[PDB]
């Protein structure tokens with residue numbers, strides 16, 4: 164359980180969607196982060212993979228604001244403290260807004276994977292995962308925006324998948340957090356994109372998995388990494 168509390172871009176903080184404050188406020192502030200109804204600080208499990216909830220989390224609506232990023236710039240997402248128990252991958256996608264992200268139909272967004280990190284070491288099962296790298300970095304993740312994509316407005320879909328309960332059907336816990344970015348620079352690629360509801364299926368090999376046993380490999384879920 165947790166959420167993204169702050170985003171650092173080009174030397175300033177953009178405050179996150181504080182899901183334990185703003186849903187209680189009823190005139191809440193404009194941010195680059197999507198609003199959600201996930202006030203339990205919880206997840207979308209396999210029952211929700213073909214519902215709109217998987218796209219940017221339960222009940223999500225676009226952020227009003229968009230943050231500009233320098234060409235090949237960093238976006239640092241700062242989480243609430245991630246529990247060591249919640250081992251699993253950290254995955255990052257962009258989808259083009261083709262206009263103001265604040266007005267997109269989330270159900271039409273087509274994501275391409277720009278970064279993935281999975282099982283790092285398995286010397287002591289359940290091992291060390293991208294989620295453990297996030298904890299070791301004091302609960303932040305750094306995303307480098309590619310220089311090779313067409314600039315424009317994009318949703319960054321940033322996600323931890325916790326696998327501590329994932330040996331059961333629908334046990335994996337997805338924690339997507341979306342923010343609005345203005346990608347800048349000279350790129351031209353329009354990578355093939357995947358609908359939110361086709362990212363994951365509840366029987367995928369990196370989704371329905373016992374992490375407590377020795378693992379020889381881990382297949383990071385979702386569509387193929389764009390390079």
Ligand SMILES: *[C@@H]1O[C@H](CO)[C@@H](O)[C@H](O)[C@H]1NC(C)=O
Nearest residue numbers: 295296297298299300301302
């Ligand atoms: C996180 O930062 C705090 C100090 O603010 C420190 O005490 C902690 O050990 C840091 N780093 C890691 C790897 O946990």
Ligand SMILES: [Cu+2]
Nearest residue numbers: 164165205249
């Ligand atoms: Cu949890």
